[PDB]
């Protein structure tokens, strides 16, 4: 079971060191069965450095184009948008990127250089990025769940995952919190299940909207 995850975000901190904390492609098991993850990185952008995102937008659209093509005779299931912190909430480029591409790819916001900030600094930045997501109605993957199927306790876990957003993912992968533990290392089973929901979300609805756009 192959999976496509793309890393997008500014040079600022280090978009090149982030892939290591897990254009260039890189490949990396369930409850016995083999699961090969195909992570792909893009160049870091700055509003003036605009010709670097149109090719990401093209790649995404083009992957969805070659499926729709095969259905008439490789697509990205998750976007890890690296946000540079400190700089009060979300930038105009961070905003303009995720509103367009948020309809085509499952964007999940992450925070770069997490270890170079305090807990109070991190709480703040988390609060603001989320405040700018609401204000600009930014279409982010907010862990949608099957109302009847994925029920109770697993719901409580999903409410907690959403809480960790924007993911400050550092060290041995790990996500940082604010309040039992400071670093959260996701159950191998849990990460895979979500990957299956992003794989399914980009096929069941995200490709469906793009298919009913050209048709």
From Swiss-Prot:
Task: Give the region (G4 motif) as residue ranges.
Answer: 112-115
Q: Which residues bind GTP?
A: 9-16, 44, 113-121, 171
- Which residues does the annotated region (G3 motif) include? 41-44
Outcome of substituting residue 14 to A = Abolishes GTP-binding; no strong effect in vivo
What residue stretch is flagged as signal peptide? none
Task: Give the GO terms filed under biological process for this record.
Answer: actomyosin contractile ring assembly; cellular bud neck septin ring organization; cytoskeleton-dependent cytokinesis; division septum assembly; mitotic cytokinesis; protein localization to bud neck; septin ring assembly; septum digestion after cytokinesis
Fill in the domain comment.
The coiled coil domain is required for the interaction with CDC3 and BEM4, but not for interaction with CDC12 or with itself.
Hey, which family's this protein in? Belongs to the TRAFAC class TrmE-Era-EngA-EngB-Septin-like GTPase superfamily. Septin GTPase family.
**UniProt function note:** Septins are GTPases involved in cytokinesis that assemble early in the cell cycle as a patch at the incipient bud site and form a ring approximate 15 minutes before bud emergence, which transforms into an hour-glass shaped collar of cortical filaments that spans both sides of the mother-bud neck. This collar persists until just before cytokinesis, when it splits into two rings that occupy opposite sides of the neck. The septins at the bud neck serve as a structural scaffold that recruits different components involved in diverse processes at specific stages during the cell cycle.
Indicate what this protein is called per its UniProt record.
Answer: Cell division control protein 11
Gene that produces this protein: CDC11
Q: Which residues of the full protein are shown?
A: 21 to 296 of 415
């Amino acid at each position: 079971i192959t999976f496509t995850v793309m890393i997008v975000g500014q040079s600022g901190s280090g978009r090149s060191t982030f892939i290591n904390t897990l254009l260039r492609e890189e490949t990396v098991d369930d409850e016995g069965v083999k699961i090969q993850l195909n992570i792909i990185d893009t160049p870091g952008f700055s509003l003036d450095n605009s010709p670097s995102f149109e090719i990401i937008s093209d790649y995404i659209r083009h992957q969805y184009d070659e499926i729709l093509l095969e259905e008439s005779r490789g697509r990205v299931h998750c976007c890890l948008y690296l946000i540079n912190p400190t700089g009060h909430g979300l930038k105009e480029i961070d905003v303009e990127f995720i509103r367009q591409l948020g309809s085509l790819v499952n964007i999940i916001p992450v925070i770069s250089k997490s270890d170079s900030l305090t807990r109070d600094e991190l709480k703040l930045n988390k609060k603001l990025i989320m405040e700018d997501i609401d204000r600009w109605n930014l279409p982010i993957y907010n862990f949608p769940f099957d109302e009847d199927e994925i029920s109770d306790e697993d719901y409580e876990t999903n409410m907690y995952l959403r809480t960790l957003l924007p993911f400050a993912i550092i060290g041995s992968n790990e996500v940082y919190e604010m309040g039992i533990s400071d670093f959260v290392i996701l159950r191998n089973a849990l990460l895979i299940s979500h990957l299956h929901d992003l794989k399914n979300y980009t096929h069941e609805i995200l490709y469906e909207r793009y298919r009913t756009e050209a048709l």
